[PDB]
Amino acid sequence: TRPIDGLTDEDIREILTRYKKIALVGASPKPERDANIVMKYLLEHGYDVYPVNPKYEEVLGRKCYPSVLDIPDKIEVVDLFVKPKLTMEYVEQAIKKGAKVVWFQYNTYNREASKKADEAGLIIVANRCMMREHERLLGEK
User: So which residues are the signal peptide here (predicted)?
Assistant: First the structure.
């Protein structure tokens, strides 16, 4: 699972440090799904997580929205857990929402969606996991 973006460990560490407002797309109440595992970890580590998934109204005690734009609070990072073909719609939303970073989790990257995000000034993190990166870059031993 090699990173697709060209950012350094320092860049990622900075992103995880400066941006605490996360819109987690593809949120799921299922404990065994990566979206749930990562969201749970983020909540336990002080992040403001706003789950997004039209199929759910609440995930891990957090109100779940059908779209990123429906979220009342400001969003800085859009953490994607959906299939590549579905990221375009959410990238367009992230753009409208004024997000600062688009984060493509494992097996979700789509070059067309990423390109639009990049042309819009969005920072791109790709083929990395927010939890994995946090653990290895900001966690202990």
Answer: none
